Ligand binder design. Structure first.
Ligand SMILES: [Zn+2]
Length: 338
């Protein structure tokens, strides 16, 4: 009723983006601030009502989550989906989804930190996203804040689904967030040990949001995704916006910590494995898998795995993450390790 065809289709069509609101029969409120920005407010908001930012498309070619979000919007508008939490749905960067690329000028998910950046289409976008976050979390209790940034991996992995929890002094690794991971059947969660520049990290660092960057499957065109493999996640996400089905029958996702961070020191840097190297590819102690100048790269422990490898990474930046399972527990409602 608010859309010509659907949230994702309208967003993708350049010829339609003026603000508009709408109140559903069940009391749910929908507000389209601008292209790809949809707020959903529950009929009966309370002090315990969650404020969830659900973003997708930070990278244009990662369509699966966009499709899931599109169906959730459709179900909420038809009353089929019960709405209990205040949400902000975002399809960031629709222009890149059209070019079917990761980005147009620069990786949007590296532009949220305080470093200096050159002017790019993505910079201006990131600038706008920081504003949307601010407006949505304004006058909300920190404990109610959630930010789920939905992505897709660019390479294979023994973990079809996994998530990354940002590093901040704020307690953003809660019991509810972890329960969500488990209910969603996310195979593993990587706990960052260093401040980042992602959209997820920005919410955690600046608004203490229970935030994650979630890798849902692989990249594929719209209508050509392996959607069934995301059924568990989608159901867990629907239960979250509806504040329902709070069970603990599922298994704990694997918890990883950063063994060490690899930084490119010289121009002559490379890995021995192929470019289609899978995330979480493990190594044995002392195994060489690359080299930086003269000094080779080899596993330190016996339980290390490589994550997010990138040999094109400019000099001085990180080329990879070495991770390993970690012994975890909850201390004062925060998931910590060791
Ligand atoms: Zn991504």
């Amino acid at each position: 009723s608010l859309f010509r065809q659907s949230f994702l289709t309208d967003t993708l069509d350049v010829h339609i983006v003026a603000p508009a609101e709408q109140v559903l029969s069940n009391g749910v409120q929908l507000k389209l601030y601008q292209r790809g920005v949809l707020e959903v407010i529950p009929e009966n908001p309370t002090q315990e009502t969650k404020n969830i930012i659900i973003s997708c498309g930070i990278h244009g070619d990662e369509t699966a989550p966009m499709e899931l979000v599109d169906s959730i919007i459709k179900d909420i508008e038809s009353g089929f989906q019960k709405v209990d939490a205040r949400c902000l749905f975002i399809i960031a960067h629709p222009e890149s989804t059209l070019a079917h690329t990761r980005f147009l000028e620069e990786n949007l998910n590296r532009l949220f930190d305080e470093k200096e950046h050159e002017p790019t289409k993505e910079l201006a976008i990131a600038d706008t996203l920081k504003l949307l976050v601010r407006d949505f979390y304004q006058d909300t209790e920190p404990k109610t804040r959630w930010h789920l940034d939905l992505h897709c991996a660019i390479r294979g992995s023994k973990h079809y689904t996994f998530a990354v929890s940002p590093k901040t002094r704020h307690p953003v690794r809660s019991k509810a967030l972890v329960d969500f991971l488990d209910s969603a059947h996310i195979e593993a969660v990587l706990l960052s040990n260093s401040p980042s520049s992602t959209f997820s990290w920005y919410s955690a660092e600046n608004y203490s949001a229970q935030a994650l960057t979630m890798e849902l499957g692989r990249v594929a065109r719209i209508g050509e995704n392996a959607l069934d493999r995301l059924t568990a996640f989608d159901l867990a996400l629907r239960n979250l916006i509806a504040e329902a089905q709070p069970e603990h029958l599922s298994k704990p996702c694997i918890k990883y910590r950063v063994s060490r961070t690899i930084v490119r020191l010289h121009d002559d840097f490379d890995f021995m494995f192929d470019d289609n190297v899978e995330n979480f590819t493990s190594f044995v102690h002392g195994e060489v898998f690359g080299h930086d100048g003269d000094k080779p790269l080899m596993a330190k422990n016996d339980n290390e795995a490589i994550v997010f490898p990138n040999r094109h990474v400019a000099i001085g930046q990180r080329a990879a993450l070495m991770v390993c399972e970690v012994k975890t527990r909850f201390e004062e409602g925060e998931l910590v390790y060791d």
